[PDB]
Copies of this chain bind each other. A is one copy, B any other.
C-alpha cells in the first residue's frame, strides 16, 4: 500500500518507549530538571540544526510539489484564523490577545521533527521518499508565517500590560518577527537554503561525516528530552480550563487534519488519482502530531498561563499515540479485500494485546509488591486488571492457533470471551463499589460476594448457551466465531454494564526529644493511616470507568448495528476496529492509570556543608515539630517544609536536587525519621533530627 502499516507499531513503539524512558528517568530522579536542561540545550543548539543542514542542502527543489505545500499552509492558516476569531469573540478582555496569540500556535504548530519524522520515515522509506522532503519543507515554512502573527498578538497583549509609546512598528512587529528569526527553526533554514543555492546540492565529503554524526543523534535524544520534560506537568485544571483544553486538543488533532485532507483533495490536480489519494491521506496523518516543544517554550518566555499550553502538550501526545494508530489504519482500510481486512484486524489486535499485556504484567507485579489489598477497593481493581491480562493472553493464544486444531481446543481458547465479558461487567462492578463508597461506612455489600459475582460472570451461562447453541462454521474472527447469538449475549451483558455505570454516575450526582520509639512517635500510626488514605485513589478509578463508558457505548452500538441490519458498508469494519482497540488496549489505559502512578565522599561534603552553614540558618525554625508522639512536643518535622526551605532561599534549585540532598543527609547521619528505620522521601511525614 501507500503506507508501511506493518511498520506503524514498531515506529510508534520506538518513539513512545524512548519518551517513556525519559518520563521514568525524570520520575526516578536519575536526571533532575536542571540536568535535563543540558540535554535540552544540546538538542536545541547543536543536534537539530545539523539535521536541518544535512537534509536541506541536498534538498532537490526541482522535483517538489508546491501545490500540496501551499495546501497545508492554507489549511493551517484557516485553522489559525478560525480559532483566533472565536477567541477574540469570546475571551477575557484582559487576556483575549494572549489567548488569540497562544491558542492558534498550539492548534497549528506540531512536533514534526522529533515525533513526526520517524513515523513518516517508517511509513514512507520505500514507498514515497519525497515525503521526507515535504516534512522538512512544510514545518519550517509554517514556522515563518503563523507563529509570527501569534507573537504579534503576544506583543498586543504586552502592550495591554504596558501602555508603551505608539510602537505600531517599534514593538508590535519588531520583537514579534525578531522572536521568529532568532529561533533555530527560521534562521538556520535561511542558512541552509543559501548554502543549497551556493552548492550544487552536494554537501562536501569532509563535512558530510561530521554532519551525519551530529544529525543521526537528534531523534532519540529529542524524544528522551520530551520524556524528561513531560514530568510534573499534568496539574489540576478548572472546568473552564478543562473545557478550553479539550476544545484546543480536539481542534489540533481532528479539525486541522481533516481541513488539510479536504484542501489536498480539492487543490491537487495531478493526473495520477492513486498518488493524489496517497498524498491526501499523508496530509491527514499530518496534523494529528502533537504540539512541538516550541509552543511550550514560547508560552514560558512570554510568561503567559503556560499551564494550559504544557498540559495541552502532554494530553496531545498521550492521545495522539492511539489517534495516529487508528487514523492511519482507517486510512489504509478502504482498499483491501474483506479477508485481508479481517487478517489486519487480527494482526493489530494481536500487537496491541501483547504490548498491553506486557504493561499489565508490570502493573500486576507493582500491585503485588504494593500490597494495597487491605481495606481498599484496590482488590477488585487489580482483579479486573488480572482479567484484562487474561483477555490479552487469550488474544495471543487465539492468534497462533486459529482456523486449525480441533473444535475442542478452539473453544478452550475461545473461553477468553468469558474473561472479556468479565472485564465489561467488572467495570460495572467498579461502578457499584464506588456506589457503596458513596454510601455510609460498613456497606451491606461485602467484598467476597462482589468478587464471587464478578468472576462468577454469567459468561459461564454464555458457555452453556454456546454448548446448546450452533457450532462454528467459519470462525474467521472472535466476533463472527460460532453465529450471531453471541452477539446478542455481548450486547445484553454490555448493556447491563453500561446501565450500572449510569446508575453509579447518577449516585455520583446524588520527655525524650532525641529518641522517639515508644514513649514518642505514636503519630507514626496516624501518618501511615494518612498514607493509606492517600493510597485510596478511587478518583483514578472514576477516571477509568468514565473513560471506558464511551467505548462500551461504541461496542454496543456496533452490535446493535449488526443485528439491527445486515449491511456492513465498511462502516462496521471501523466499528469492529474500535471494539478491538478497546478490548485489547485496555492494558494501555490501565498502565496509564496504574504502574506509572504514585504510592561516598560526596555525601560527606554534603553533610558537612549542611551542618556547618545551613544548620546555623535557623534549623530550629526550619525543623518545625509539633507534639512528637505522646511525650515530647518538638521531636520530628515534615519533609515538605524542608524542601520548601531548600527551594525558597536558594539552597537547592528545585525539589529534585533537594530530595537528593535530603537523601545525602540521611546517608550522612544528619537527618532521621520518626521510627529511625525509614528513609527520607519529602512528604508530610514527620522526620527526626539526628545529631
Contact = CB atoms under 8 A, between A and B. Distances in A.
Nearest to A6: B205
Interface stretch (A37-45, A68-76, A188-196, A541-549): A37-45
Given A25-B46, A303-B600, A214 B206 contact: no
A6 to B, nearest CB: 8
A36 B207 CA distance: 25
Interface string A654-665: 000000000000
Contact of A42 (B17, B31, B218, B601): B31
Nearest to A214: B220
Nearest to A212: B14
Contacts of A206: 9-10, 13, 351, 354-355
A326 to B, nearest CB: 18
Contacts of A213: 14-15, 18, 118, 219-220, 223
A41 B30 contact: yes
Interface in A7-22: 7, 9-11, 13-15, 17-18, 21
Q: Which of A9, A217, A354, A355 has the most CB of B within 10 A?
A: A217
Interface in A153-207: 205-207
Interface in A231-274: none
A83 to B, nearest CB: 27
Q: Which of A45, A213, A215, A303 has the most CB of B within 10 A?
A: A213
Given A35-B38, A38-B31, A303-B600, A47 B14 contact: no
Contacts of A528: none
A221 interface: yes
Interface string A539-558: 00000000000000000000
B41 A25 contact: yes
Contacts of A205: 10
Contacts of A67: none
A218 B213 CA distance: 10
Contacts of A219: 213, 216-217
A646 to B, nearest CB: 16
A286 interface: no
A208 interface: yes
A122 B31 CA distance: 33
A7 B41 contact: no
B39 A42 contact: yes
B209 A11 contact: yes
A529 interface: no
4 A-B pairs closest in CB distance = A217-B220, A35-B38, A10-B209, A14-B209
